[PDB]
Amino acid sequence: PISPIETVPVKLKPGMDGPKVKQWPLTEEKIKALVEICTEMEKEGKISKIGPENPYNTPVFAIKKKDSTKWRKLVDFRELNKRTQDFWEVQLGIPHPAGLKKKKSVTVLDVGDAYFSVPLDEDFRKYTAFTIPSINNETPGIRYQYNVLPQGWKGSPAIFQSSMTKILEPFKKQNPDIVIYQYMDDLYVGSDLEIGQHRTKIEELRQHLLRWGLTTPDKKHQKEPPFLWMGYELHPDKWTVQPIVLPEKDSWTVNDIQKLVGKLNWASQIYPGIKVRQLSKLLRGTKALTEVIPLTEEAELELAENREILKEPVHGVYYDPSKDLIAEIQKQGQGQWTYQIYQEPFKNLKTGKYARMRGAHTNDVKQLTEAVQKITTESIVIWGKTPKFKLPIQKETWETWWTEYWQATWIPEWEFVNTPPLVKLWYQLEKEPIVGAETFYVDGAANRETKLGKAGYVTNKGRQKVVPLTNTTNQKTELQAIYLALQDSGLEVNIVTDSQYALGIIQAQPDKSESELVNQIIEQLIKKEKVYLAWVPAHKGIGGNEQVDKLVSAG
Amino acid sequence: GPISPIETVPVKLKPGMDGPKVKQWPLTEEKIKALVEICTEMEKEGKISKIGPENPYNTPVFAIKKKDSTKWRKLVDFRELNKRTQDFWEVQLGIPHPAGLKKKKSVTVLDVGDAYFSVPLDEDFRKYTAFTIPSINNETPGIRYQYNVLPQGWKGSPAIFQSSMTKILEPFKKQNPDIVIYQYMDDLYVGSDLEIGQHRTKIEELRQHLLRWGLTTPDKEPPFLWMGYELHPDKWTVQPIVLPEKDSWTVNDIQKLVGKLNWASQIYPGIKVRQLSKLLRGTKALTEVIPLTEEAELELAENREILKEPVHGVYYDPSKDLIAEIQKQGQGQWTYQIYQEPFKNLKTGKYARMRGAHTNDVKQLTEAVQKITTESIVIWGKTPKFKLPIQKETWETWWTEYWQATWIPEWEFVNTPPLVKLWYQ
Numbered sequence: 001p002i003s004p005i006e007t008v009p010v011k012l013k014p015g016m017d018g019p020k021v022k023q024w025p026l027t028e029e030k031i032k033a034l035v036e037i038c039t040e041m042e043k044e045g046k047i048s049k050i051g052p053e054n055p056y057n058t059p060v061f062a063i064k065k066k067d068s069t070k071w072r073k074l075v076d077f078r079e080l081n082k083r084t085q086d087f088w089e090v091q092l093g094i095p096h097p098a099g100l101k102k103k104k105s106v107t108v109l110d111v112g113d114a115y116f117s118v119p120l121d122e123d124f125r126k127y128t129a130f131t132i133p134s135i136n137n138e139t140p141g142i143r144y145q146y147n148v149l150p151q152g153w154k155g156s157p158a159i160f161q162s163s164m165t166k167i168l169e170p171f172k173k174q175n176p177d178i179v180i181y182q183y184m185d186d187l188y189v190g191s192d193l194e195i196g197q198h199r200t201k202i203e204e205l206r207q208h209l210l211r212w213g214l215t216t217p218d219k220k221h222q223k224e225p226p227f228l229w230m231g232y233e234l235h236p237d238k239w240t241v242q243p244i245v246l247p248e249k250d251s252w253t254v255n256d257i258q259k260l261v262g263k264l265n266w267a268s269q270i271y272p273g274i275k276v277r278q279l280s281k282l283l284r285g286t287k288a289l290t291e292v293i294p295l296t297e298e299a300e301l302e303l304a305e306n307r308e309i310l311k312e313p314v315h316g317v318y319y320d321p322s323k324d325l326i327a328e329i330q331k332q333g334q335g336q337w338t339y340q341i342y343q344e345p346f347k348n349l350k351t352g353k354y355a356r357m358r359g360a361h362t363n364d365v366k367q368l369t370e371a372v373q374k375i376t377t378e379s380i381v382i383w384g385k386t387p388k389f390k391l392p393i394q395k396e397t398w399e400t401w402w403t404e405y406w407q408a409t410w411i412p413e414w415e416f417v418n419t420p421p422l423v424k425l426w427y428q429l430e431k432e433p434i435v436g437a438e439t440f441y442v443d444g445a446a447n448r449e450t451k452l453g454k455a456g457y458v459t460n461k462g463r464q465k466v467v468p469l470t471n472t473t474n475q476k477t478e479l480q481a482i483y484l485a486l487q488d489s490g491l492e493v494n495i496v497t498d499s500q501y502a503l504g505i506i507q508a509q510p511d512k513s514e515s516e517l518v519n520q521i522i523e524q525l526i527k528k529e530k531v532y533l534a535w536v537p538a539h540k541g542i543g544g545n546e547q548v549d550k551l552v553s554a555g
Numbered sequence: 556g557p558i559s560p561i562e563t564v565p566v567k568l569k570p571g572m573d574g575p576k577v578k579q580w581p582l583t584e585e586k587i588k589a590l591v592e593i594c595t596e597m598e599k600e601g602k603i604s605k606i607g608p609e610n611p612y613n614t615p616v617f618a619i620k621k622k623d624s625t626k627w628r629k630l631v632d633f634r635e636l637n638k639r640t641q642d643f644w645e646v647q648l649g650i651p652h653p654a655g656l657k658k659k660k661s662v663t664v665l666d667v668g669d670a671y672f673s674v675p676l677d678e679d680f681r682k683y684t685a686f687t688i689p690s691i692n693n694e695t696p697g698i699r700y701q702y703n704v705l706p707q708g709w710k711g712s713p714a715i716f717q718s719s720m721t722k723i724l725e726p727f728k729k730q731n732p733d734i735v736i737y738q739y740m741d742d743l744y745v746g747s748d749l750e751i752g753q754h755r756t757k758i759e760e761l762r763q764h765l766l767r768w769g770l771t772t773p774d775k776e777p778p779f780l781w782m783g784y785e786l787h788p789d790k791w792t793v794q795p796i797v798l799p800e801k802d803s804w805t806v807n808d809i810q811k812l813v814g815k816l817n818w819a820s821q822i823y824p825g826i827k828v829r830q831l832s833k834l835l836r837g838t839k840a841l842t843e844v845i846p847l848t849e850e851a852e853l854e855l856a857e858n859r860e861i862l863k864e865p866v867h868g869v870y871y872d873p874s875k876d877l878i879a880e881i882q883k884q885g886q887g888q889w890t891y892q893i894y895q896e897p898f899k900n901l902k903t904g905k906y907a908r909m910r911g912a913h914t915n916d917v918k919q920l921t922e923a924v925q926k927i928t929t930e931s932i933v934i935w936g937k938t939p940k941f942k943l944p945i946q947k948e949t950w951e952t953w954w955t956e957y958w959q960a961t962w963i964p965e966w967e968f969v970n971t972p973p974l975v976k977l978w979y980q
């Protein structure tokens with residue numbers, strides 16, 4: 001049998017030749033199963049016996065899927081993948097079901113078997129060759145090569161998808177009102193035809209595909225809501241993701257963890273708070289598939305919290321382009337934010353939770369801004385437009401923040417929603433020095449060998465202090481000095497520093513820090529009624545600065 | 556499609572470099588619709604061809620509307636390809652910049668990028684121009700295309716077209732020898748000292764020269780040639796460093812001054828602060844008024860005079876990057892400096908009351924970037940690299956909503972607040 005589909009030219013990465021992982025012998029029954037598999041693949045043209053001038057070989061395992069006595073062939077194409085050209089990988093993310101619009105009639109067809117129905121570039125086929133080992137180690141091995149896209153080869157997703165797009169193009173042109181969405185194994189077909197006509201178009205589509213050698217099995221044709229497409233349950237007016245069950249194992253294989261990471265990657269597109277860092281670290285190295293890894297305690301905290309999030313089903317509604325998109329955000333504390341995207345109240349398209357980006361010093365307004373940006377980009381991906389925002393920050397608070405913040409910053413059209421806890425500014429510095437407020441000149445100094453230092457102030461009233469410090473640095477003493485001045489001043493205070501670092505931290509307007517010292521300074525700033533912070537260059541003869549510099553010099 | 560009648564120029568990437576592999580960013584629905592429409596017609600005209608995923612290269616695409624335009628224009632972000640493309644001096648098709656342009660009383664910028672599509676692109680180079688129109692919600696694979704003709708926004712296109720542009724403009728330049736014309740990327744800059752009415756008439760004469768050459772290579776060809784954006788560079792001003800004039804100085808005022816003069820002494824070596832700092836002896840309240848001594852008033856006067864003179868040792872080097880820094884000053888005001896070596900500023904400036912003033916910082920910063928880039932093209936002939944006072948994620952969420960130019964400069968993000976702000980304040 002020959003395929004009418006034209007092959008895609010494929011190349012090895014520049015400079016590289018065929019595979020160099022040779023062929024394993026295995027037990028009597030295992031090979032006994034393989035010849036039956038490969039003979040029946042050769043019957044449908046998927047593989048072909050090759051001649052005596054092919055020098056390539058690719059390894060193979062044998063594993064079971066749900067354990068009957070019928071072995072499933074397992075090929076580790078990681079070796080061929082690293083020598084195969086890149087393909088521009090067109091879809092990074094997966095469709096989200098709330099991006100779908102309502103269709104009178106919907107059908108989901110399965111083409112997951114189609115990989116083996118797409119021919120592979122002939123000049124590349126020789127690099128997929130393998131050997132069935134001798135059964136008694138006497139006769140030469142039967143050598144076959146792949147004629148079709150193999151499962152697990154890096155090019156198969158790209159080439160299959162490209163082939164489907166080209167086969168589907170004429171059909172979509174003939175039927176501009178039908179929507180066909182493609183994502184690997186499943187094909188979504190939606191129309192607003194009455195159900196009888198829609199059924200007819202489906203049969204036309206299926207005959208079209210078969211003409212090109214692509215079959216859609218009769219079982220996996222879903223005509224009842226819920227249609228399952230890409231793990232989503234599509235009902236007529238809502239969609240559901242059923243709780244995702246993760247494996248439970250005493251010891252984990254690399255194939256196990258790889259399959260696990262892929263499942264968690266898909267789930268993170270639907271569920272929030274899914275983490276994959278620590279599990280992926282276990283995949284480092286040239287480790288083969290059947291090979292046992294130990295779980296770090298990081299990896300099991302990651303896994304355990306994932307299973308708790310995934311306990312719950314997720315439901316939502318479909319997109320109505322005739323209506324606004326609305327996004328509402330709430331502060332949940334400890335760096336956490338929740339959000340809902342909807343068009344009519346309480347009918348959610350998507351809900352999620354944003355975590356603070358890590359860093360030494362932050363504030364709630366910046367985090368709110370980050371959450372807005374993240375939701376915006378998500379909404380562009382899913383629906384192609386920016387939602388209108390409902391935010392727990394007063395318009396006056398936001399106005400004070402953005403206009404006075406030294407960086408450019410902005411939020412798109414939004415309205416205040418009175419959902420406590422409201423985001424607020426916890427302190428605001430004066431723009432001008434305070435008449436009648438004591439002026440504290442601060443400085444610090446530390447020995448870079450011993451870590452011994454001093455922090456202190458002098459004031460226009462003759463108030464002075466210097467505190468010796470152990471286990472410190474020059475920048476830390478500068479912050480200690482400011483803290484001392486805040487502690488020992490009245491509710492209104494002018495403070496003069498020469499530390500661009502310390503000024504810059506306070507210029508960044510934090511309301512929480514990883515540094516306990518910055519936090520104590522924040523606490524002080526909150527208690528004050530007015531604080532003016534000025535900067536002067538060190539060692540330029542400025543009176544009070546020079547006096548405190550001498551106070552904190554080592555003795 | 557057909558092999559073009561015109562013979563192509565061989566082009567290569569820089570030695571040792573591969574082509575671009577840059578992810579497409581997500582696009583709004585209106586821009587995807589515009590791109591699908593534009594690319595469908597360009598494909599029918601043979602300017603681009605569909606490709607598959609076996610082409611491993613990619614460059615981002617989006618679409619913009621020029622100022623006061625309602626028509627979408629395709630904008631491919633070839634910044635990475637442009638960095639990886641050979642220089643065209645050695646192949647002997649660089650484009651030199653005229654120092655007289657900035658002196659003209661009027662300069663009109665024309666979009667001539669459509670002309671480039673009349674010249675074919677070297678077949679072996681086409682794969683490096685791959686781009687992908689994405690789909691809403693990842694519902695369909697992106698539509699992948701590559702160029703068969705000189706693309707807009709690629710630095711190779713004006714280089715390879717220049718011999719044609721020279722023939723096209725030859726009769727107009729002969730008849731108007733005092734008009735200065737400079738080509739930069741997709742734009743033609745046309746400067747004259749004529750009266751504005753007569754200037755505009757000359758620009759229309761030039762436009763007709765270009766459309767009359769449109770008869771000989773039909774791909775319709777006046778989509779954006781119609782637009783005339785007008786500049787007046789002889790009236791461009793610089794924002795010098797100024798010191799306050801006050802009848803009463805407080806301790807805080809004098810501290811601010813010494814800090815500014817100390818910083819400025821890195822640019823102007825003759826600056827002194829000794830007599831001013833002498834006023835600051837003791838440990839004083841910030842709001843106490845300090846009367847200036849004769850010696851301090853003379854030091855301040857001397858300093859004001861130094862700051863009125865240009866910086867020493869500053870010369871433009873076209874082999875070096877131009878850098879532009881921008882500070883947000885508040886109340887819709889934005890300062891900027893252009894330099895190649897720190898403290899050797901080629902220009903300093905200040906903008907106010909731009910689109911988005913008092914409501915949208917990102918729009919205002921985008922406009923400043925565009926104005927600074929236009930000035931740089933006019934003055935020195937190339938675009939600066941920007942240091943932007945904004946977080947990456949904020950800028951990258953929004954800048955394409957406000958971009959109105961057919962070039963795109965390079966940029967980096969500044970996250971530590973500079974004292975330079977109060978100094979240019």
Ligand SMILES: O=c1[nH]c2sc(Cc3ccccc3)cc2c(=O)n1O
Pocket residue numbers: 443444445498499538539549
């Ligand atoms: O005593 C101090 N000396 C200095 S030098 C400096 C930066 C610098 C480094 C090298 C040359 C000139 C200038 C900061 C401080 C400071 O904060 N204190 O307290």
Ligand SMILES: [Mn+2]
Pocket residue numbers: 443444478498499538
């Ligand atoms: Mn100091």
Ligand SMILES: [Mn+2]
Pocket residue numbers: 443444445538549
């Ligand atoms: Mn000091």
